[PDB]
Design an enzyme around this catalytic site. Structure first.
Site, PDB file in Angstrom:
ATOM      1  N   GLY A 166       2.877 -15.249   1.119  1.00 33.16           N
ATOM      2  CA  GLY A 166       3.199 -14.729   2.429  1.00 33.16           C
ATOM      3  C   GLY A 166       4.675 -14.901   2.735  1.00 33.16           C
ATOM      4  O   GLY A 166       5.424 -15.564   2.009  1.00 33.16           O
TER       5      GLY A 166
ATOM      6  N   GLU B  57       6.881 -12.477  -1.645  1.00 29.40           N
ATOM      7  CA  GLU B  57       7.659 -11.427  -0.990  1.00 29.40           C
ATOM      8  C   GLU B  57       9.152 -11.753  -1.101  1.00 29.40           C
ATOM      9  O   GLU B  57       9.744 -12.230  -0.134  1.00 29.40           O
ATOM     10  CB  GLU B  57       7.178 -11.309   0.510  1.00 29.40           C
ATOM     11  CG  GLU B  57       5.654 -11.128   0.578  1.00 29.40           C
ATOM     12  CD  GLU B  57       5.096 -10.946   1.980  1.00 29.40           C
ATOM     13  OE1 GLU B  57       5.881 -10.714   2.921  1.00 29.40           O
ATOM     14  OE2 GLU B  57       3.850 -11.049   2.141  1.00 29.40           O
TER      15      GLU B  57
ATOM     16  N   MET C  80       1.941  -3.208   1.247  1.00 30.21           N
ATOM     17  CA  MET C  80       2.220  -3.604   2.626  1.00 30.21           C
ATOM     18  C   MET C  80       2.973  -2.467   3.320  1.00 30.21           C
ATOM     19  O   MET C  80       4.160  -2.552   3.657  1.00 30.21           O
ATOM     20  CB  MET C  80       2.963  -4.929   2.662  1.00 30.21           C
ATOM     21  CG  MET C  80       2.057  -6.074   2.263  1.00 30.21           C
ATOM     22  SD  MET C  80       2.863  -7.671   2.276  1.00 30.21           S
ATOM     23  CE  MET C  80       3.860  -7.578   0.793  1.00 30.21           C
ATOM     24  N   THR C  81       2.239  -1.367   3.511  1.00 34.77           N
ATOM     25  CA  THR C  81       2.763  -0.134   4.107  1.00 34.77           C
ATOM     26  C   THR C  81       2.749  -0.228   5.638  1.00 34.77           C
ATOM     27  O   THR C  81       2.098   0.535   6.354  1.00 34.77           O
ATOM     28  CB  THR C  81       2.011   1.084   3.570  1.00 34.77           C
ATOM     29  OG1 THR C  81       0.646   0.740   3.299  1.00 34.77           O
ATOM     30  CG2 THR C  81       2.647   1.574   2.270  1.00 34.77           C
TER      31      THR C  81
ATOM     32  N   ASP D  40       5.404  -2.698   8.804  1.00 32.89           N
ATOM     33  CA  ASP D  40       6.709  -3.339   8.996  1.00 32.89           C
ATOM     34  C   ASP D  40       7.836  -2.452   8.459  1.00 32.89           C
ATOM     35  O   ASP D  40       8.884  -2.951   8.015  1.00 32.89           O
ATOM     36  CB  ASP D  40       6.761  -4.695   8.290  1.00 32.89           C
ATOM     37  CG  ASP D  40       5.825  -5.712   8.908  1.00 32.89           C
ATOM     38  OD1 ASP D  40       5.372  -5.513  10.067  1.00 32.89           O
ATOM     39  OD2 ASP D  40       5.504  -6.684   8.185  1.00 32.89           O
TER      40      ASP D  40
HETATM   41  C1  LIG Z   1       7.761  -8.076   3.852  1.00 35.18           C
HETATM   42  C2  LIG Z   1       6.862  -7.407   4.848  1.00 35.18           C
HETATM   43  O1  LIG Z   1       5.933  -6.668   4.503  1.00 35.18           O
HETATM   44  N1  LIG Z   1       7.134  -7.647   6.135  1.00 35.18           N
HETATM   45  C3  LIG Z   1       8.192  -8.537   6.590  1.00 35.18           C
HETATM   46  C4  LIG Z   1       7.748  -9.288   7.842  1.00 35.18           C
HETATM   47  O2  LIG Z   1       6.621 -10.104   7.535  1.00 35.18           O
HETATM   48  C5  LIG Z   1       8.875 -10.140   8.417  1.00 35.18           C
HETATM   49  O3  LIG Z   1       8.552 -10.440   9.770  1.00 35.18           O
HETATM   50  C6  LIG Z   1       8.262 -11.826   9.979  1.00 35.18           C
HETATM   51  O4  LIG Z   1       6.935 -12.149   9.569  1.00 35.18           O
HETATM   52  C7  LIG Z   1       6.624 -13.540   9.731  1.00 35.18           C
HETATM   53  C8  LIG Z   1       5.261 -13.759   9.116  1.00 35.18           C
HETATM   54  O5  LIG Z   1       4.238 -13.156   9.896  1.00 35.18           O
HETATM   55  C9  LIG Z   1       6.688 -13.908  11.211  1.00 35.18           C
HETATM   56  O6  LIG Z   1       6.434 -15.300  11.366  1.00 35.18           O
HETATM   57  C10 LIG Z   1       8.059 -13.566  11.781  1.00 35.18           C
HETATM   58  O7  LIG Z   1       8.066 -13.761  13.191  1.00 35.18           O
HETATM   59  C11 LIG Z   1       8.425 -12.113  11.474  1.00 35.18           C
HETATM   60  N2  LIG Z   1       9.778 -11.821  11.925  1.00 35.18           N
HETATM   61  C12 LIG Z   1      10.114 -10.685  12.545  1.00 35.18           C
HETATM   62  C13 LIG Z   1      11.556 -10.556  12.948  1.00 35.18           C
HETATM   63  O8  LIG Z   1       9.291  -9.799  12.774  1.00 35.18           O
HETATM   64  C14 LIG Z   1      10.207  -9.386   8.475  1.00 35.18           C
HETATM   65  C15 LIG Z   1      11.379 -10.300   8.758  1.00 35.18           C
HETATM   66  O9  LIG Z   1      12.615  -9.693   8.409  1.00 35.18           O
HETATM   67  O10 LIG Z   1      10.487  -8.715   7.235  1.00 35.18           O
HETATM   68  C16 LIG Z   1       9.487  -7.791   6.876  1.00 35.18           C
HETATM   69  O11 LIG Z   1       9.894  -7.047   5.774  1.00 35.18           O
HETATM   70  C1  NGO Z   2      -0.102  -9.184   2.988  1.00 35.85           C
HETATM   71  C2  NGO Z   2       0.569  -9.874   4.131  1.00 35.85           C
HETATM   72  N1  NGO Z   2       1.294 -10.928   3.937  1.00 35.85           N
HETATM   73  C3  NGO Z   2       2.499 -10.813   4.794  1.00 35.85           C
HETATM   74  C4  NGO Z   2       2.391  -9.332   5.174  1.00 35.85           C
HETATM   75  O1  NGO Z   2       0.985  -9.123   5.168  1.00 35.85           O
HETATM   76  O2  NGO Z   2       2.955  -8.955   6.387  1.00 35.85           O
HETATM   77  C5  NGO Z   2       2.331  -9.728   7.390  1.00 35.85           C
HETATM   78  C6  NGO Z   2       2.598  -9.053   8.736  1.00 35.85           C
HETATM   79  O3  NGO Z   2       3.973  -8.662   8.840  1.00 35.85           O
HETATM   80  C7  NGO Z   2       2.905 -11.152   7.292  1.00 35.85           C
HETATM   81  O4  NGO Z   2       2.481 -11.939   8.411  1.00 35.85           O
HETATM   82  C8  NGO Z   2       2.433 -11.794   5.974  1.00 35.85           C
HETATM   83  O5  NGO Z   2       3.220 -12.973   5.688  1.00 35.85           O
END
Ligand SMILES: CC(=O)N[C@@H]1[C@@H](O)[C@H](O[C@@H]2O[C@H](CO)[C@@H](O)[C@H](O)[C@H]2NC(C)=O)[C@@H](CO)O[C@H]1O
Ligand code: NGO
Length: 499
Positions: free
Chosen positions: A95, A143, A211-212, A214
């Site tokens: 994660g 990731e 992970m389609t 964010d």
């Molecule tokens: C990599 C992906 O698929 N998504 C990434 C997000 O998960 C990420 O956002 C962050 O996720 C954390 C886990 O849930 C949260 O704790 C955190 O608050 C959250 N941050 C924001 C700003 O949304 C972001 C961060 O750059 O990247 C995506 O790619």
């Molecule tokens: C497969 C899964 N693992 C990641 C991804 O989902 O994005 C989630 C939501 O942004 C984030 O919380 C998590 O760490």
């Protein structure tokens, strides 16, 4: 045909495990008992999340976890298999928090896969954890591995696969074999890290869960849909980082596969995977979000779409202004930038000032708060009609979602996905997929069927001429060409002949 996978994350933080209760939503908002028999029947997989890789380079629970309580929680999940003989309780390692480039455990991911001996120890620990706690497979959510780390990651997946196959034999589990999956990047920038070796990554997997979502967020200047199915020409576009991956392809081959700039959409990610030789559609699973992403400081004009915004991007959220009106879960979680579908329904139903709007190009809904300047991008049972039809048309493996606690109390999003795949009375033959922008790239793994006249030796072919030769349709890159197709650089393989 084959049943579509429906893979739902069950995420529970360590403090909720340690204080686990099924009768106090202020301590555990979404206990296992909320996954009713009906919901268990609609899932094929639950991804329990998250475990980690420790400094000993082994799969491990957070060391603050009360092990007795952890086993109790996992046992409640595996008990659900009594209601569904196809259901698997996977466990997920990684994660964002643990495994992102700046995450607390990142070096342990790099080091666990770095050498043959490290990979053996890591792989063994994964299967040991699986057996000790009663899980049905291993899901790895790093990731994301960088290009230089990909070979070790691949070798680690191959090694886990062999050990899982041994375990399937030992336990006589051929009817429900132990599985290996990953959560994969759903956008080209992170995908570019390992894209060139995608076939080797996917080969040991039962599924790659894209992970389609964010695909928009506070880190972007311009608000956008976070999981648009198809593109909107009015929306932002992005550089296609895949054209710079170490593929060894020619200019024409790269250009045909990687239009740039392009619309960052679910369709783009799926097609980018299909374009690669050896990546079967049946292993690709489309991720969908059960939450919305909220932005503030948006302008009017287009319902908050494609606007500048003033949404903090820092983690944790940097102040106590919970400005997403009506989002009580946001106050609980101290962050107004994410709202579960469960909460979004209540926000729309209450006197909170939101309009629900629909983009018929992206096939996704959004909320607009005109008075305060808020925009929320999310998915619902309507956007899932189009995504489910796409999953069927593209012959994908199924759907994945984050996370189960964000569905509404009645499980309406999960029930919708199950209906669109399995209900005998549901008919989407007339569902119009719209005129949103499709990703047009073609690569070696998704050559279209074509016809053309047979190549003729001695004939001088002008630029753009099409011929059939040795099972394929070829196009000249320039003229005039007289070489046999495939014998030199002048011919582009553009299609395949039908059998
Ligand atoms: C990599 C992906 O698929 N998504 C990434 C997000 O998960 C990420 O956002 C962050 O996720 C954390 C886990 O849930 C949260 O704790 C955190 O608050 C959250 N941050 C924001 C700003 O949304 C972001 C961060 O750059 O990247 C995506 O790619
Ligand atoms: C497969 C899964 N693992 C990641 C991804 O989902 O994005 C989630 C939501 O942004 C984030 O919380 C998590 O760490």
């Amino acid at each position: 045909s084959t049943r579509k996978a429906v893979i739902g994350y069950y995420f529970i933080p360590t403090n909720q495990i340690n204080n686990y209760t099924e009768t106090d939503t202020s301590v555990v908002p979404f206990p296992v008992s909320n996954i009713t028999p009906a919901k268990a029947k609609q899932l094929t997989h639950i991804n329990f999340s998250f475990l980690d890789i420790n400094s000993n380079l082994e799969c491990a629970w957070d060391p603050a976890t009360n092990d007795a309580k952890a086993r109790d929680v996992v046992n409640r999940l595996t008990a659900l298999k009594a209601h569904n003989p196809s259901l698997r309780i996977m466990f997920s390692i990684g994660g964002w928090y643990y495994s992102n480039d700046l995450g607390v455990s990142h070096a342990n991911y790099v080091n666990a896969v770095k050498t043959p001996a490290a990979r053996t120890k890591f792989a063994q620990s994964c299967v040991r954890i699986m057996k000790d706690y009663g899980f049905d497979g291993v899901d790895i959510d790093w990731e994301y591995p960088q290009a230089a780390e990909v070979d070790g990651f691949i070798a680690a997946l191959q090694e886990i696969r062999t050990l899982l196959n041994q375990q399937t034999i030992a336990d006589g589990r051929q009817a429900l074999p132990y599985q290996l999956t990953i959560a994969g990047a759903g956008g080209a920038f992170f995908l570019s890290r390992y894209y060139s070796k995608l076939a080797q990554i996917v080969a040991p997997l039962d599924y790659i869960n894209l992970m389609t979502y964010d695909l928009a967020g506070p880190w972007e200047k311009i608000t956008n849909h976070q999981a648009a199915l198809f593109g909107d020409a009015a929306g932002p576009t992005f550089y296609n980082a895949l054209r710079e991956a170490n593929l060894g392809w020619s200019w024409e081959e790269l250009t045909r596969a990687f239009p740039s700039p392009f619309s960052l959409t679910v369709d783009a990610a799926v097609q980018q995977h299909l374009m690669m030789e050896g990546v079967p559609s049946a292993k690709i699973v489309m991720g969908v979000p059960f939450y919305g992403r909220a932005f503030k400081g948006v302008s009017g004009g287009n319902g908050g779409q494609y606007s500048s915004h003033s949404t903090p991007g820092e983690d944790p959220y940097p102040n106590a202004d919970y400005w997403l009106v009506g989002c009580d879960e946001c106050v609980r979680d101290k962050d107004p930038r994410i709202a579960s579908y469960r909460q979004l329904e209540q926000m729309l139903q209450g006197n909170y000032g939101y309009q629900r709007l629909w983009n018929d190009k992206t096939k996704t809904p959004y909320l607009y708060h005109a008075q305060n300047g808020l925009f929320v991008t999310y998915d619902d049972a309507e956007s899932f009609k189009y995504k489910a039809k796409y999953i069927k048309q593209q012959q994908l493996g199924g759907v994945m979602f984050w996370h189960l606690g964000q569905d509404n109390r009645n499980g309406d999003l999960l029930a919708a996905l199950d209906r669109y795949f399995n209900a005998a009375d549901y008919d989407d033959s007339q569902l119009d997929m719209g005129t949103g922008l499709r990703y047009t790239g073609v690569g070696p793994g998704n050559l279209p069927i074509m016809t053309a006249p047979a190549y003729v030796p001695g004939t001088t072919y002008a630029q753009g001429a099409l011929v059939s030769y040795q099972g394929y349709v070829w196009q000249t890159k320039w003229g005039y060409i007289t070489s046999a197709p495939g014998s030199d650089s002048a011919w582009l393989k553009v299609g395949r002949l039908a059998a």
